[PDB]
Amino acid sequence: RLWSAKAPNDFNLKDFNVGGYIQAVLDRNLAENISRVLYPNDNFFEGKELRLKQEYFVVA
Amino acid sequence: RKQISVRGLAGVENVTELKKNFNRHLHFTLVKDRNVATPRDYYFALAHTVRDHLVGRWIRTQQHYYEKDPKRIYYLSLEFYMGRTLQNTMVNLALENACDEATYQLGLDMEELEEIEEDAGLGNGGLGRLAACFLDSMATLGLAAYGYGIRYEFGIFNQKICGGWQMEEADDWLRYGNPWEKARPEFTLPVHFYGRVEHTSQGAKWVDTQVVLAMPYDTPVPGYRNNVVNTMRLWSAKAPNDFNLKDFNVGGYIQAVLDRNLAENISRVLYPNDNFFEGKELRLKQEYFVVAATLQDIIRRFKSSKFGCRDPVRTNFDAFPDKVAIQLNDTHPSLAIPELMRVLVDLERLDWDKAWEVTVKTCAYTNHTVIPEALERWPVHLLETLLPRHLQIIYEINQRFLNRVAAAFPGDVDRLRRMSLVEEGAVKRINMAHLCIAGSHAVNGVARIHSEILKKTIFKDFYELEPHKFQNKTNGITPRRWLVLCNPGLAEIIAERIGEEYISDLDQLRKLLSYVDDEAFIRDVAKVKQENKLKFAAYLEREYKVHINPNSLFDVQVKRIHEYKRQLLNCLHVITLYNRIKKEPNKFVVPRTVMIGGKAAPGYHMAKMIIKLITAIGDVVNHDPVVGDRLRVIFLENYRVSLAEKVIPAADLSEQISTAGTEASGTGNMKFMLNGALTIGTMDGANVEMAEEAGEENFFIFGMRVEDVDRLDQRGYNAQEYYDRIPELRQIIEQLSSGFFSPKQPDLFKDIVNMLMHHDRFKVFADYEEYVKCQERVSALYKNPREWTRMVIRNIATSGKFSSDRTIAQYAREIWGVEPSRQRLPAP
Amino acid sequence: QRGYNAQEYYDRIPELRQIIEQLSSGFFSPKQPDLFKDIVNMLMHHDRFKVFADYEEYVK
Ligand SMILES: *Cc1c(COP(=O)(O)O)cnc(C)c1O
Numbered sequence: 001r002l003w004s005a006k007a008p009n010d011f012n013l014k015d016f017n018v019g020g021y022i023q024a025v026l027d028r029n030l031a032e033n034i035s036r037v038l039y040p041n042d043n044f045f046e047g048k049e050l051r052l053k054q055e056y057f058v059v060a
Numbered sequence: 061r062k063q064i065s066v067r068g069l070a071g072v073e074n075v076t077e078l079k080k081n082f083n084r085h086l087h088f089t090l091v092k093d094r095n096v097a098t099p100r101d102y103y104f105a106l107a108h109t110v111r112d113h114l115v116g117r118w119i120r121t122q123q124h125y126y127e128k129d130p131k132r133i134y135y136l137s138l139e140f141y142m143g144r145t146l147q148n149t150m151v152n153l154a155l156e157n158a159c160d161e162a163t164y165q166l167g168l169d170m171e172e173l174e175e176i177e178e179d180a181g182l183g184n185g186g187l188g189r190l191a192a193c194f195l196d197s198m199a200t201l202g203l204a205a206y207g208y209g210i211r212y213e214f215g216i217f218n219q220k221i222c223g224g225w226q227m228e229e230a231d232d233w234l235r236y237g238n239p240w241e242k243a244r245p246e247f248t249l250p251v252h253f254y255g256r257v258e259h260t261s262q263g264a265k266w267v268d269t270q271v272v273l274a275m276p277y278d279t280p281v282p283g284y285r286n287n288v289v290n291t292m293r294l295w296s297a298k299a300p301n302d303f304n305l306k307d308f309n310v311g312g313y314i315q316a317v318l319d320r321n322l323a324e325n326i327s328r329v330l331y332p333n334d335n336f337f338e339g340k341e342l343r344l345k346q347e348y349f350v351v352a353a354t355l356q357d358i359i360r361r362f363k364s365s366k367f368g369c370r371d372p373v374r375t376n377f378d379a380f381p382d383k384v385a386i387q388l389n390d391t392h393p394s395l396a397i398p399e400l401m402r403v404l405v406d407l408e409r410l411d412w413d414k415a416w417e418v419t420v421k422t423c424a425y426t427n428h429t430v431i432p433e434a435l436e437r438w439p440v441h442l443l444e445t446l447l448p449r450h451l452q453i454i455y456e457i458n459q460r461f462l463n464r465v466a467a468a469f470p471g472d473v474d475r476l477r478r479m480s481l482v483e484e485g486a487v488k489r490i491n492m493a494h495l496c497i498a499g500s501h502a503v504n505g506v507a508r509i510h511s512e513i514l515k516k517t518i519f520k521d522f523y524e525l526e527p528h529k530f531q532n533k534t535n536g537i538t539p540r541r542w543l544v545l546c547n548p549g550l551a552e553i554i555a556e557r558i559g560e561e562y563i564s565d566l567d568q569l570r571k572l573l574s575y576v577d578d579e580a581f582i583r584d585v586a587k588v589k590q591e592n593k594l595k596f597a598a599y600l601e602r603e604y605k606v607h608i609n610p611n612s613l614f615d616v617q618v619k620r621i622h623e624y625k626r627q628l629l630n631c632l633h634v635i636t637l638y639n640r641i642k643k644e645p646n647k648f649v650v651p652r653t654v655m656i657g658g659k660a661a662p663g664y665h666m667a668k669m670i671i672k673l674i675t676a677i678g679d680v681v682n683h684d685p686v687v688g689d690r691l692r693v694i695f696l697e698n699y700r701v702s703l704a705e706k707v708i709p710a711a712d713l714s715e716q717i718s719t720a721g722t723e724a725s726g727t728g729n730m731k732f733m734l735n736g737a738l739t740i741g742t743m744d745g746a747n748v749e750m751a752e753e754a755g756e757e758n759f760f761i762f763g764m765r766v767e768d769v770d771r772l773d774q775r776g777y778n779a780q781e782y783y784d785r786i787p788e789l790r791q792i793i794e795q796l797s798s799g800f801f802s803p804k805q806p807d808l809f810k811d812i813v814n815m816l817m818h819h820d821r822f823k824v825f826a827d828y829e830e831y832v833k834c835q836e837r838v839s840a841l842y843k844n845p846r847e848w849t850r851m852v853i854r855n856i857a858t859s860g861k862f863s864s865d866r867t868i869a870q871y872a873r874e875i876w877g878v879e880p881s882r883q884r885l886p887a888p
Numbered sequence: 889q890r891g892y893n894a895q896e897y898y899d900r901i902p903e904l905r906q907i908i909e910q911l912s913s914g915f916f917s918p919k920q921p922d923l924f925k926d927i928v929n930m931l932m933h934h935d936r937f938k939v940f941a942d943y944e945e946y947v948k
Pocket residue numbers: 184185186189618619620699700701702704705726727728729731
């Protein structure tokens with residue numbers, strides 16, 4: 001059983017944050033890309049906040 | 061190789077094999093079991109066990125259209141209001157009773173499972189309902205048609221009422237997969253946005269564009285027991301997914317996130333017309349997208365259904381009008397006309413005047429406005445950035461068209477500034493309506509008084525310069541969805557007298573006229589209307605709640621909540637009946653259940669103040685102890701195709717009250733008629749033809765007619781001058797603004813009292829006496845059940861002019877130039 | 889309290905008749921005649937601020 005990330009697609013009115021603003025065009029994207037790219041260890045270029053986001057994703 | 065064959069699969073139409081084919085899918089397709097399954101599971105499972113039977117014939121039809129290479133008719137539209145597919149697919153293929161018996165011996169309930177399907181989140185109202193009606197007749201008339209449109213991931217919002225106020229939830233009707241579609245990745249296509257026009261010596265080119273991928277999704281559409289099942293190719297945008305380096309551009313900024321969200325939400329949302337908030341780049345972005353991934357799939361088809369062979373002129377488009385017809389439902393495909401011209405002149409290379417007769421012979425436009433401002437108009441600056449080659453084209457079309465125009469009316473110059481494609485002025489714009497007519501051969505309106513008012517005012521100077529174009533095809537309804545599956549009890553007795561024949565050509569229903577006086581027929585029509593009403597009382601408590609009294613006159617108005625459709629008139633007479641019942645209590649009122657339904661439109665403030673006026677009226681009248689069941693006002697929630705399949709069969713009177721001369725036709729109109737209800741209406745839209753088929757004497761017409769709407773305008777309507785005559789109007793207005801209907805916010809409905817009183821763009825108050833007059837005539841005759849039912853019999857035996865099979869045959873024959881057959885065609 | 893009907897003055901005053909006239913006819917704009925149709929329909933029909941009512945006593 002494998003997990004793929006999906007962002008809540010509520011973005012044009014949920015929580016009533018929007019209309020006014022989409023910084024959140026990025027929640028759906030650095031989220032959709034927690035599962036796009038593999039990121040293999042003992043290397044990589046800099047202990048990226050994306051990998052800590054993939055591993056606690058797989059776990060939760 | 062030849063043993064790879066459809067021939068073999070599926071055995072007998074046996075509950076027997078159907079129970080068995082239902083167990084495979086539950087386990088092998090769903091990978092579910094008995095113990096872990098949901099009703100949603102068993103629906104998906106049944107909906108795959110219909111589907112095997114469904115797709116085998118779609119294989120066979122389309123391959124039968126390869127070999128017999130017919131002309132193809134592409135019904136092109138931004139909105140397919142498709143509704144629900146399990147029962148209509150079971151009844152268009154004969155399965156209902158085998159599936160019914162199957163699931164029943166399998167321990168389950170079908171009417172139950174059927175209810176777990178959710179309306180294909182894919183259209184918004186009129187324009188699209190019609191598409192999905194035209195789509196089913198287009199099948200059933202043997203026609204070679206294709207529906208082409210945008211697959212909307214989340215349709216057009218949901219209506220939830222809270223606080224009395226409308227609230228809009230999102231519909232992610234794609235949330236558990238939609239069984240009916242077969243996602244087609246293999247046939248994706250680039251649509252090119254933005255870019256530059258560089259003129260090579262051999263031609264011009266549209267260089268340096270943004271590309272968006274147009275992936276196809278394919279849904280079958282079966283006809284009524286004839287075996288053609290046609291295609292509905294629907295498109296979803298997908299940005300190119302190379303996002304870290306590709307173009308040797310990034311490692312720097314990612315702005316690039318935005319194509320994968322501004323291409324991505326080209327198919328993520330309906331933007332429904334004659335409104336919206338601002339003629340955004342996104343809607344022009346979407347018109348071109350459904351159009352461009354389609355003229356492309358069109359031509360591609362054209363070159364390959366045995367067509368290197370049906371040449372005989374360098375695969376020429378000489379035989380393209382022969383073998384293709386493109387119908388432009390409203391000015392929403394407006395660009396397939398110049399996208400046709402870019403694709404023939406540049407990419408192939410036909411000369412600019414041989415690529416033209418091909419275009420203008422290959423297209424037709426269906427019009428649906430009557431008040432002109434409403435017509436489409438994109439600012440040219442927009443068109444320049446976004447579709448630059450196309451604005452190159454619409455301009456030379458304009459240069460030629462205005463020169464044909466003077467090749468005909470010399471000296472007139474002032475006509476040229478009216479028949480151009482450009483509206484100079486405030487900010488320069490390209491009036492898509494002219495483009496459509498110019499680029500076409502046939503220009504049909506959708507009702508006789510409508511197709512005439514086009515002809516004579518709106519599109520007048522075109523009428524003059526070319527008569528042959530302008531057609532009509534009044535609007536129509538399909539008897540299979542709107543009689544055989546929504547009202548099988550009314551369906552049943554019409555067949556119990558005159559056999560099923562009618563289903564397939566609705567003029568046989570005129571035979572029903574003769575049983576007007578067979579006393580048994582009459583008790584049967586009302587046995588049925590009592591049956592349908594008492595399922596609705598029931599749904600109206602079980603799944604949402606009130607205390608509907610079965611025996612009341614079911615007053616229903618299901619409209620888009622706009623100001624010109626008048627539910628305010630309708631609210632004023634309920635506040636009026638509420639006052640008589642409260643002034644003198646012991647008097648006989650025929651009790652009514654008034655049910656208004658329809659979605660508002662976000663950002664329409666007035667439309668939202670009305671939905672609240674109605675629910676507020678609802679807490680007073682439905683709670684006040686004097687009034688009993690004598691009245692209830694019910695606001696109907698999240699009105700949509702399956703709800704209407706529920707309400708319309710239980711309606712006794714339906715409120716067609718739009719200001720005379722505002723509507724091209726009305727299709728709900730026809731559903732209520734075929735379904736046993738008196739109509740109460742202004743003379744307008746499609747009322748006129750339904751009055752002339754049924755006879756005025758059976759229709760509850762009233763109010764201002766076009767003539768005297770015009771005339772009130774010349775003297776100038778002053779709502780206070782009617783308010784001044786009529787006491788009860790003052791009684792009810794003064795309750796609105798006294799805060800009678802909103803106890804804790806007094807000045808609340810002030811929004812509506814002022815608008816009514818001084819700024820009424822639509823003459824609510826004018827038609828107030830006459831409206832409550834016809835209504836008393838309605839209440840009066842419902843007191844006489846052999847005669848209400850005797851009227852209903854006249855009104856419904858008269859439905860034939862209103863099946864979409866008629867409308868479509870006149871399309872098929874007079875425009876799409878093909879004769880619509882109705883031959884069974886074979887299958888395994 | 890009386891409902892300002894604008895077309896009313898329209899009909900006494902021959903001048904005013906004659907100047908709403910010229911505007912929408914297309915007098916004051918022959919390349920775009922229709923143009924001040926807006927203003928016409930504002931004045932003859934939806935005028936909140938009562939232009940035609942203060943005309944004559946102003947002209948005068
Ligand atoms: C048929 C139908 C329409 C048509 O409404 P009109 O009264 O013709 O404008 C729209 N919505 C639903 C749900 C329908 O069933």
